[PDB]
Amino acid sequence: TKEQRILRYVQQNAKPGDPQSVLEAIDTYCTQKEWAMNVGDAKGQIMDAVIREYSPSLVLELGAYCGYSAVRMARLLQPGARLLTMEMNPDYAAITQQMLNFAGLQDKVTILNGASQDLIPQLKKKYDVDTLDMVFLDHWKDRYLPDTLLLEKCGLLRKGTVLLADNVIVPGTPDFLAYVRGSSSFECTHYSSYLEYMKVVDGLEKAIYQGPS
Ligand SMILES: C[S@@+](CC[C@H](N)C(=O)[O-])C[C@H]1O[C@@H](n2cnc3c(N)ncnc32)[C@H](O)[C@@H]1O
Ligand SMILES: O=[N+]([O-])c1cc(O)c(O)c([N+](=O)[O-])c1
Ligand SMILES: [Mg+2]
């Protein structure tokens, strides 16, 4: 499979225990051999700046795939900080685990195998999560809004929680984008960039929870 090839490429070309080389290996492979739905370096660079500004202690990612963004975020996390990433496809989840192991960030990241809708309500109980500092949304686009509402219902959002969403332009997340921008409960900022492995304009949306009205 493609995911297996990306992993093999990393194993044979990246420096173990070096997150940077791992990222560069994946980017090179996808740029030159096969396109893959990783956020990429262009947008990844914006992600890094946001992570550095907020220095989150607990981060939740929706959509791991092959672990590119998990490696990207975790390498910048402070000692004691945790990253929980959800992935419903067991095959992708396996690749991600191996990717994290090679990068040497396995102690910082916890992979949750399951659909976000089923896992979100169990976060407080099974993983000792109080409130989230940051959430990275990058799973199926039609899930952004329902999961954001679900996160709020479960009491996982505090005043100041940062939601960062990918693909708000391409493929697009119409309902979510309209909701956050129109809600008094969120303060939004848009970062223009480009779709991974091409000149299509895309962007990330930062929406900071202000609490309910
Ligand atoms: C765009 S790809 C992931 C990108 C990844 N963030 C990166 O940059 O490396 C997202 C994924 O989320 C999955 N995903 C979709 N719906 C999901 C859901 N409801 N809960 C969890 N995982 C889901 C797919 O199986 C796929 O691996
Ligand atoms: O089709 N695409 O170009 C993309 C890009 C992306 O960055 C995605 O996250 C995606 N998806 O989750 O389906 C699809
Ligand atoms: Mg994406």
Verbal overview:
This protein has one domain: Vaccinia Virus protein VP39 (Rossmann fold, 3-Layer(aba) Sandwich). It contains ten helices and seven strands. It has helices at 2-13, 19-32, 40-54, 68-74, 90-103, 116-119, 123-127, 144-153, 168-172, 174-182, and strands at 58-62, 82-87, 109-113, 132-137, 157-165, 186-194, 201-209. Strands 3-2-1-4-5-7-6 form a seven-stranded mixed β-sheet, sandwiched between helices. Helix 1 crosses helix 2 (19-32) and helix 3 runs parallel beside helix 4 (68-74).
Question: What is the CATH homology-level superfamily?
Answer: Vaccinia Virus protein VP39
**Overall domain count:** 1
CATH class: Alpha Beta
CATH architecture: 3-Layer(aba) Sandwich
Alpha-carbon distance between the termini?
A: 48 Å
Task: Give the biggest beta sheet.
Answer: 7 strands, mixed
The tally of helices reads: 10
GO cellular component, one term: dendritic spine
Function: Catalyzes the O-methylation, and thereby the inactivation, of catecholamine neurotransmitters and catechol hormones. Also shortens the biological half-lives of certain neuroactive drugs, like L-DOPA, alpha-methyl DOPA and isoproterenol.
EC number: 2.1.1.6
Keywords: Catecholamine metabolism, Cell membrane, Cytoplasm, Lipid metabolism, Magnesium, Membrane, Metal-binding, Methyltransferase, Neurotransmitter degradation, Phosphoprotein, S-adenosyl-L-methionine, Signal-anchor, Transferase, Transmembrane, Transmembrane helix
